[PDB]
Structure 1
């Protein structure tokens, strides 16, 4: 058991363009449980360098929690052994109109601070030879989001990965989000938010198809 056929295509396709998350070759496959006990230590250290009484029955566990949260959760998207199982059906209905999925839950982390990123993504595409199972578009967004990110790049990734799996370039990804490393820290701006978009295929070349999308983006409930 290695990877998946789609995960390969997708990963490679992102490296070609250099839109892959800056990683170093894994080299040797250091036990996964081993990386948690190690990471925990470094935390068990940072907490002491801050004078946090690790004798406390609550703070005590913290280090193992943060470790687990890193290896197994908020960053699981860095291992392609986690790429969502993609499923498509043949386009017999012949849908030549865009299918949209709006207000997709996106939970991420800026790579600059390792601080929360709360945002919504709106994906859209024009089926060609096949139609993707709706939920997939969800799982894919969340996949790339579970990584130390940069908004402008996270968007590009979602765009390319979908084109790849879809077999078209007629895909559009738009992400609207808030950076707590901007809201609860430093400039502490309570009301701003950043919106990034990546247009492919007709979405970028056709003035008409372009705006037909942008207009239907950014909705509440």
Structure 2
């Protein structure tokens, strides 16, 4: 009937470190539909200001599609009600070596221009008492990515979230991404990409562990 234990813990953990995405507390419990109608209205206006003919079949539904996309899709991560269900199992295997999930599909939106960020994450962790379900790592990366973002902040949030859930600081996150506000606009750099890393526990502390992780990052197909 509310946020899960994990959603709450992770959110609290992020607020405490001052890492939460700039979001304002629920000012009014207004149904999403009203938000979507409102947003669509604004988009109708913007399109009119761009002199686009909204009468055309190809543009007619765009304001509603954009509203739905903002509220229901690309920024779904802002609502913790969409936080992934987390499942863990006892580390009976007694695994004390890192588990790495590489090339995680990452789709995000840069907050400076509200434009596509296309990337891939690599997450590693040394299991302590529990082993997390592999897909949950993918879902967590994707939860934070479905928000207007700053890559540097995104990498931190995923790290903190995982540390919190796994009960260990021994987590490492790395994200490699192409920002379309850099690529298809402005400086229009067709080839560059940005890499950001957030190292936890031994990944930070131990150069041995650190470089094992870093060496593993970016392995072509």
TM-score by length of 2: 0.99
1:153 corresponding residue in structure 2: 153
CA distance in structure 1 between the partners assigned to 2:27 and 2:57 by the alignment: 38
Q: What SS does the aligned partner of 1:159 have?
A: helix
- TM-superposition CA deviations, 1:176-198 (whole Å, max 9, x none): 00000000000000000000000
1:96 corresponding residue in structure 2: 96
How many aligned positions are there?
221
Which structure 2 residues correspond to residues 20-169 of structure 1 after superposition, within 5 A?
20-169=20-169
| 1:25 CA displacement | 1.4
CA distance in structure 2 between the partners assigned to 1:20 and 1:87 by the alignment: 23
- TM-superposition CA deviations, 1:40-65 (whole Å, max 9, x none): 00000000001001111110111000
CA distance in structure 2 between the partners assigned to 1:157 and 1:25 by the alignment: 18
CA distance in structure 1 between the partners assigned to 2:90 and 2:16 by the alignment: 28
Unaligned runs of 5+ in 1: none
| 1:169 CA displacement | 0.1
Q: What SS does the aligned partner of 2:174 have?
A: strand
| 1:27 CA displacement | 1.7
CA distance in structure 1 between the partners assigned to 2:184 and 2:168 by the alignment: 40
CA distance in structure 2 between the partners assigned to 1:197 and 1:27 by the alignment: 34
- TM-superposition CA deviations, 1:11-52 (whole Å, max 9, x none): 000000010001111121111111000000000000000100
Q: What SS does the aligned partner of 2:45 have?
A: helix
Q: What SS does the aligned partner of 1:94 have?
A: coil
CA distance in structure 2 between the partners assigned to 1:50 and 1:31 by the alignment: 29
2:189 corresponding residue in structure 1: 189
CA distance in structure 2 between the partners assigned to 1:91 and 1:219 by the alignment: 27
| 1:220 CA displacement | 1.4
Q: What SS does the aligned partner of 2:59 have?
A: coil
CA distance in structure 2 between the partners assigned to 1:45 and 1:28 by the alignment: 24
Unaligned runs of 5+ in 2: none
| 1:172 CA displacement | 0.1
- TM-superposition CA deviations, 1:132-165 (whole Å, max 9, x none): 0000000000000000000000000000000000
